[PDB]
Ligand binder design. Sequence first.
Ligand SMILES: O=C(O)C(F)(F)C(F)(F)C(F)(F)C(F)(F)C(F)(F)C(F)(F)C(F)(F)C(F)(F)C(F)(F)F
Length: 134
Amino acid sequence: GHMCDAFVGTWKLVSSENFDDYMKEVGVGFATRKVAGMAKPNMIISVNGDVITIKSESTFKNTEISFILGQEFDEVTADDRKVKSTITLDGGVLVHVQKWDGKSTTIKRKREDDKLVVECVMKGVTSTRVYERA
Ligand SMILES: O=C(O)C(F)(F)C(F)(F)C(F)(F)C(F)(F)C(F)(F)C(F)(F)C(F)(F)C(F)(F)C(F)(F)F
């Protein structure tokens, strides 16, 4: 249960690039996009045996996903998509693919320097969000 040791802890947002464009490509509505952009999320990543939990906390929406690496699971995203999600550990990076409605998006959670970087890709649009330890 050590696969994820470099990710565990609490994290807070430093910077965001192209996040609104990413949500646009995903199909998120205007009001939800504006709420999401205003959020200052606190992210908690924790491990309990084989089960990893990623929690995002913000004033107006929390999400929590718990999963086993490599095991597909049902996720209801913050924008209310019902997706089939699989997260694997590849080259020290958590690679999260969401599949729904004939579409897919990939969320990579990686370490760079002392930061946790979240890279989200939808049809060639990439958002990069940088977190520092809380
Ligand atoms: O900052 C992070 O923790 C993050 F980068 F990991 C993340 F949270 F942004 C994400 F990757 F999970 C995400 F982009 F997919 C997302 F969950 F936010 C979303 F953009 F897909 C979303 F649309 F669901 C929304 F922004 F939360 C919504 F618009 F619904 F509020």
